[PDB]
Amino acid sequence: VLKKNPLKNKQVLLRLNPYAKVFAAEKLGSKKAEKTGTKPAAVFTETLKHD
Amino acid sequence: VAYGYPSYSTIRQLVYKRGFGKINKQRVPLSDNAIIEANLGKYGILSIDDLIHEII
Amino acid sequence: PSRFTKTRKHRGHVSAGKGRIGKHRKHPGGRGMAGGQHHHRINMDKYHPGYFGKVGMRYFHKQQAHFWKPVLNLDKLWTLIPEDKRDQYLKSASKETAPVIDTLAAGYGKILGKGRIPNVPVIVKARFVSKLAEEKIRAAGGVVELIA
Amino acid sequence: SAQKAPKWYPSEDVAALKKTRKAARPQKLRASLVPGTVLILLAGRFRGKRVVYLKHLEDNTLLISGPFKVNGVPLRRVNARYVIATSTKVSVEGVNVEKFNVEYFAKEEIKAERVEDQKVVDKALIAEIKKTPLLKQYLSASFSLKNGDKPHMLKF
Amino acid sequence: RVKANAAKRAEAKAQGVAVQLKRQPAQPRESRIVSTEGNVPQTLAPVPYETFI
Amino acid sequence: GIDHTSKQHKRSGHRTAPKSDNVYLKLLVKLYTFLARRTDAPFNKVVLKALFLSKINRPPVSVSRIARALKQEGAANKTVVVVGTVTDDARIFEFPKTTVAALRFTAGARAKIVKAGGECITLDQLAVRAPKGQNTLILRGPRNSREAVRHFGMGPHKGKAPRILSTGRKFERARGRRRSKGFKV
RNA sequence: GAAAUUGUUGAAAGGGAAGGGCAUUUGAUCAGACA
RNA sequence: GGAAUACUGCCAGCUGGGACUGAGGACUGCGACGUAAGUCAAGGAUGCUGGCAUAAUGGUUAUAUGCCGCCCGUCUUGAAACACGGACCAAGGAGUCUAACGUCUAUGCGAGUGUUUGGGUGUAAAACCCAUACGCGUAAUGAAAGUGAACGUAGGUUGGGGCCUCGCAAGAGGUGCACAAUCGACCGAUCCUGAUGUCUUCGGAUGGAUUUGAGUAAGAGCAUAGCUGUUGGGACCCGAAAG
RNA sequence: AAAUAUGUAAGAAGUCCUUGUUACUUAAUUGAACGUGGACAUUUGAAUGAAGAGCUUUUAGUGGGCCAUUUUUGGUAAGC
RNA sequence: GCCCUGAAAAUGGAUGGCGCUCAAGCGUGUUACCUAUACUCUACCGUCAGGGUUGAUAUGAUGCCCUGACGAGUAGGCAGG
RNA sequence: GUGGCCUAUCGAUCCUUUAGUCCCUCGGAAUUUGAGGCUAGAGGUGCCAGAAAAGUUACCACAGGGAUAACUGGCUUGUG
Numbered sequence A: 001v002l003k004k005n006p007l008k009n010k011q012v013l014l015r016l017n018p019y020a021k022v023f024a025a026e027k028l029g030s031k032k033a034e035k036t037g038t039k040p041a042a043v044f045t046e047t048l049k050h051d
Numbered sequence B: 001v002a003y004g005y006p007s008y009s010t011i012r013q014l015v016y017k018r019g020f021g022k023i024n025k026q027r028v029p030l031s032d033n034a035i036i037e038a039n040l041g042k043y044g045i046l047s048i049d050d051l052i053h054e055i056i
Numbered sequence C: 001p002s003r004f005t006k007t008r009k010h011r012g013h014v015s016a017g018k019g020r021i022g023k024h025r026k027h028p029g030g031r032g033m034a035g036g037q038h039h040h041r042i043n044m045d046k047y048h049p050g051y052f053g054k055v056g057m058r059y060f061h062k063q064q065a066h067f068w069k070p071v072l073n074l075d076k077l078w079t080l081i082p083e084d085k086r087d088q089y090l091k092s093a094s095k096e097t098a099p100v101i102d103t104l105a106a107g108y109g110k111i112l113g114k115g116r117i118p119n120v121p122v123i124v125k126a127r128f129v130s131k132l133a134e135e136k137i138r139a140a141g142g143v144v145e146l147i148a
Numbered sequence D: 001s002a003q004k005a006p007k008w009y010p011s012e013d014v015a016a017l018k019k020t021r022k023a024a025r026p027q028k029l030r031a032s033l034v035p036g037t038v039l040i041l042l043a044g045r046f047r048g049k050r051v052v053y054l055k056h057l058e059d060n061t062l063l064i065s066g067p068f069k070v071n072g073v074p075l076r077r078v079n080a081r082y083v084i085a086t087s088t089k090v091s092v093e094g095v096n097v098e099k100f101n102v103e104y105f106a107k108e109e110i111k112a113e114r115v116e117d118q119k120v121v122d123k124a125l126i127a128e129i130k131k132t133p134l135l136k137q138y139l140s141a142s143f144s145l146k147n148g149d150k151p152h153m154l155k156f
Numbered sequence E: 001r002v003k004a005n006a007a008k009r010a011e012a013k014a015q016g017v018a019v020q021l022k023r024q025p026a027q028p029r030e031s032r033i034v035s036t037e038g039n040v041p042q043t044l045a046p047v048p049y050e051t052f053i
Numbered sequence F: 001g002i003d004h005t006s007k008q009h010k011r012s013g014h015r016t017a018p019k020s021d022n023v024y025l026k027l028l029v030k031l032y033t034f035l036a037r038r039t040d041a042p043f044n045k046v047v048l049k050a051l052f053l054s055k056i057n058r059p060p061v062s063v064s065r066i067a068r069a070l071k072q073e074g075a076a077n078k079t080v081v082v083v084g085t086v087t088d089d090a091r092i093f094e095f096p097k098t099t100v101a102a103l104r105f106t107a108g109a110r111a112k113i114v115k116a117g118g119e120c121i122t123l124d125q126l127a128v129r130a131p132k133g134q135n136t137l138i139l140r141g142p143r144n145s146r147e148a149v150r151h152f153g154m155g156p157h158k159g160k161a162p163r164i165l166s167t168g169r170k171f172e173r174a175r176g177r178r179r180s181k182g183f184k185v
Numbered sequence G: 001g002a003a004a005u006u007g008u009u010g011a012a013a014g015g016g017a018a019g020g021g022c023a024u025u026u027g028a029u030c031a032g033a034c035a
Numbered sequence H: 001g002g003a004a005u006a007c008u009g010c011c012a013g014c015u016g017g018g019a020c021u022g023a024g025g026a027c028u029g030c031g032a033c034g035u036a037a038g039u040c041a042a043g044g045a046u047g048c049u050g051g052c053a054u055a056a057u058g059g060u061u062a063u064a065u066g067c068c069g070c071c072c073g074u075c076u077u078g079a080a081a082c083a084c085g086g087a088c089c090a091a092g093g094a095g096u097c098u099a100a101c102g103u104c105u106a107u108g109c110g111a112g113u114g115u116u117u118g119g120g121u122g123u124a125a126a127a128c129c130c131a132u133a134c135g136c137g138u139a140a141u142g143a144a145a146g147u148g149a150a151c152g153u154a155g156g157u158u159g160g161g162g163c164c165u166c167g168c169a170a171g172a173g174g175u176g177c178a179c180a181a182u183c184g185a186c187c188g189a190u191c192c193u194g195a196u197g198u199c200u201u202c203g204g205a206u207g208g209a210u211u212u213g214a215g216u217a218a219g220a221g222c223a224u225a226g227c228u229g230u231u232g233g234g235a236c237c238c239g240a241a242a243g
Numbered sequence I: 001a002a003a004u005a006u007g008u009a010a011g012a013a014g015u016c017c018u019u020g021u022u023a024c025u026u027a028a029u030u031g032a033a034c035g036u037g038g039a040c041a042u043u044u045g046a047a048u049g050a051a052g053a054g055c056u057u058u059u060a061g062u063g064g065g066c067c068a069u070u071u072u073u074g075g076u077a078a079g080c
Numbered sequence J: 001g002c003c004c005u006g007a008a009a010a011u012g013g014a015u016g017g018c019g020c021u022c023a024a025g026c027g028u029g030u031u032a033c034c035u036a037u038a039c040u041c042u043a044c045c046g047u048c049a050g051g052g053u054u055g056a057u058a059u060g061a062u063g064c065c066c067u068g069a070c071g072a073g074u075a076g077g078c079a080g081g
Numbered sequence K: 001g002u003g004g005c006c007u008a009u010c011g012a013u014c015c016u017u018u019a020g021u022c023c024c025u026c027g028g029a030a031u032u033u034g035a036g037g038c039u040a041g042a043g044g045u046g047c048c049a050g051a052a053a054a055g056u057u058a059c060c061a062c063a064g065g066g067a068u069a070a071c072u073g074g075c076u077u078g079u080g
């Protein structure tokens, strides 16, 4: 008879989507990605700085 | 109208906060996964995040 | 009764239900059948097509009941027999003992053929008959006797 | 009769209240309120008095004492929301303050127990006070807004 | 189309399931990588006012 | 405001209970409303509704219409249900024996039903017998046999029943009714 | 023994009409309601 | 060469201040935390304290103040209008009744229905009762003479609610009233055909037709009553100049 | 020869096979129309929506219109 | 482009007023802010809709119950009072 | 080939008058004149869905009209 909002009710956040439990646990929203090194060809940068 | 390309985040926050079901019309507040499965369960989809999946 | 009448609900309402522009006035049409072939024509054609003009022979001093010939078919015809003596005759279809149905005594002038009596023979005393009527009778073993 | 009687009547049964879920959890005070923080009393009887803060009691009130010998406030209950927590602090490590619970103030002139209890706590404090010059002369003066004071600007 | 669907269906079914015979409308474009190779972006600019009457 | 895609506040135009104030009727309704709610069997839902219909929608079921219905394949041992009065047809001769559950029976109707060895049940008696309504034949009467519906839809070239008190030659048979006066219909 | 309308008495207010609506101060006035 | 930062985006990351709300009334639901026992913020406010119980709090009213507010009624595309009526008050003041009819509804009976012209009777304009007729309905069609409704389970086809059979079910089949579309058959009118016979002109068998009817095809009506609508009436109320 | 607008179609009343009826049609069971019997129903044949769909009777007021943008006729024009 | 001239009418008068000149004027850009009977949300009234409810030991079965959407209105129609 | 290549060249009810079958009817029964019906044309309404129709009023009258003229006023400004 009174609609509780998830997103601010941890009780109703976990009454749907129980993965929220795990989610909070590994934090998952700050997850860092493996930093790679790939570089663009000089073409891409040459035409980017073109006139 | 105004429109565009909803990211997952807003699709979730839409359905979570303001998502409601049509059941014999009636506009039922979702609030329990048991509701979705009762209707959209015939399609798969027994959870709200199952719904959000079939949307995005 | 006036308390269910709608002119009660229209108390206070100024135009009585009759409209502010169109009023309610004496005779916008004329009176009665006025305008029959002029302004009320679109009604009288359809609605009453044929209402105008002349059609057929005149009959001076016609009396009905020269024409009195009430009709009964074999549709019933047995209904003339009282229900009790009726069943006695249905079983025991026979010549030499046959129910005598006087149709003119019943108030009937001619017997028609609406069809399907039982195979009982019946002696039918009538004024007139349809051909098919009287045929169904003899086909079941009865006869028709003309009377006056 | 003058009026027909109703065909139905409300049952004069009183119903039971649905089982509520509100569990009274202990309050958290704002961090500003450290025992031995001088307070400015904003309202009530001693409004304007500057006062010393001892305990956080069980009804959430704040045990304060003037001290009595200084500004005349006794050991007293005061509401946290009606006080300004200042930044000047005296050491109450070594003041008993155990004795004083809610029931200490049950209402039922001055019971001599209070007179002596005031004396032991004030004596404790006033000693700690003289450690820091003017602070007794501070606690005696009342607080007031001078023209130009901007409480939203003011560091207390 | 009908006749195509029968031949699509029979060949499908006697091969197996997986028939798709309803008409889908034009879908969004799928991802792609356009090669720069020997195709180098041509830079164009808006052009000034002229008359030539 | 909204863009209303349907008329607002619109009643269904289906009767809810009957307009009849006959008390026994209201009870007969009370039975089947209860039956219909609890049964799950459709025969009761139909009979609930057919109890509300006006006199115009309860067109009389003749005893001979009842004879012929039972002549269907496998229908002769069913019990025939008529929500409304049943009347007598002198025009049949051999009549079957069956059980007829009706609101009312004109004298002749029950007399003919009975004298063939049959049975006249009021619909509540049928209820106890056939609570799910099992093994029943519902027989509807001639709705459009009514005189009034002759005149419905009058128009040129429509061939329906002019509204005319006295009927004869020189009652609406002349100009517009025949090629030789004016035109034809 | 109503109303229009009139006298006296009391009350209140009035800078080129009067009356009205939401709201509150002020005055007058009326409860209910605590136990 | 290696950082930082901007900028945009994400987090089921933490959190401070202020406002409005507290609908419901045993229980049940989905959960959450904890080994646990229990506990909870999980299908809608409870807890602690103080006051006034006097005149706190409310309603009414007059006034003042802020902001807003043109005369009503009418006819009109448009009225506060330099459009009409209306100084004020009371009382009176306008869609009736009747004859006849349409649709719908309720009721009695039902292939029938209508006691009330009249008679009987009476506790006397009532109530209660009735014999013959009559009215409407149960046959239509044709100007008329006149003829007058089953090839068939009162037909076939396609849909039909309900019921029936098989199946756990999904589903299959069966019968199918009302109703809807279509092709047929019947009765009258119309136009052809013209057998047997004959008081030689009667008689009209038989088979036909882009014809035609307010018909038939296992009756639906009669009577009371109600709203609304029609018409005739002073006919919603007041109004001519005339005759 | 555009734009806007506009007709029809997007399946079970579908598609296909076998082969009855007929007095119409062809030289011709050739056709034509209506069928019996038979195969195929998970996407039974585009998208979106649907507070469902269909259907009948009966009666009110109305039948002075005026305005804005766009197309536009008469008019120098007009609150024409 | 702005500015001046071109530019004559009758009661006294109108960027709405007062006034405003690196504007309180013209062009443009970025922000915060103000308030509709609209939008989100709650309560309450009614209207419509779909649900549940038989009996007993209670009393409104038209009753009671859960739930959703909706609410402008002349002439006019119906309804409940 | 069911009039004029196609798109225009036309006419209710009452009445009359032709043509048609030899058909129905004059109602106490017949025959014969005469009359009346049925079906299809013609005779015409051009205000063309179809009245039978001269003026005058400064001697005047009524119901209305700002749905509509004669002055101001308003828009217009060809004209001045």
Ligand SMILES: CN[C@@H]1[C@@H](O)[C@@H](O[C@@H]2[C@@H](O)[C@H](O[C@H]3O[C@H](CN)CC[C@H]3N)[C@@H](N)C[C@H]2N)OC[C@]1(C)O
Binding pocket: G013, G014
């Ligand atoms: C009932 N008595 C009233 C009395 O109350 C008063 O009425 C005033 C009236 O004068 C004011 O009117 C005038 O005075 C206001 C102040 N100067 C400005 C507006 C002006 N019209 C109204 N605004 C308010 C009424 N209640 O003055 C008139 C009167 C009739 O004597």
Ligand SMILES: CN[C@@H]1[C@@H](O)[C@@H](O[C@@H]2[C@@H](O)[C@H](O[C@H]3O[C@H](CN)CC[C@H]3N)[C@@H](N)C[C@H]2N)OC[C@]1(C)O
Binding pocket: J037
């Ligand atoms: C359609 N009913 C509406 C009803 O929805 C409601 O509307 C309010 C409206 O009065 C409020 O507005 C009110 O309060 C505002 C301050 N908060 C200032 C303006 C004032 N009218 C709005 N804030 C919200 C609407 N739903 O109140 C007015 C009304 C007419 O009864």
Ligand SMILES: [Mg+2]
Binding pocket: none
């Ligand atoms: Mg937040």
Ligand SMILES: [Mg+2]
Binding pocket: C001
């Ligand atoms: Mg009446």
Ligand SMILES: [Mg+2]
Binding pocket: C003, C008
């Ligand atoms: Mg009333």
Ligand SMILES: [Mg+2]
Binding pocket: C009, C010, C013
């Ligand atoms: Mg009304």
Ligand SMILES: [Mg+2]
Binding pocket: C013
């Ligand atoms: Mg009204």
Ligand SMILES: [Mg+2]
Binding pocket: C014
């Ligand atoms: Mg009035």
Ligand SMILES: [Mg+2]
Binding pocket: C016, C017, C018, I060
């Ligand atoms: Mg009216």
Ligand SMILES: [Mg+2]
Binding pocket: C015, C019, C020, C023
């Ligand atoms: Mg009027």
Ligand SMILES: [Mg+2]
Binding pocket: C021
């Ligand atoms: Mg008019």
Ligand SMILES: [Mg+2]
Binding pocket: C022, C023, C024, C028
């Ligand atoms: Mg009118």
Ligand SMILES: [Mg+2]
Binding pocket: C038
């Ligand atoms: Mg005319």
Ligand SMILES: [Mg+2]
Binding pocket: C067
């Ligand atoms: Mg005759």
Ligand SMILES: [Mg+2]
Binding pocket: none
């Ligand atoms: Mg006759």
Ligand SMILES: [Mg+2]
Binding pocket: C102, C104, C105, C147
């Ligand atoms: Mg005799």
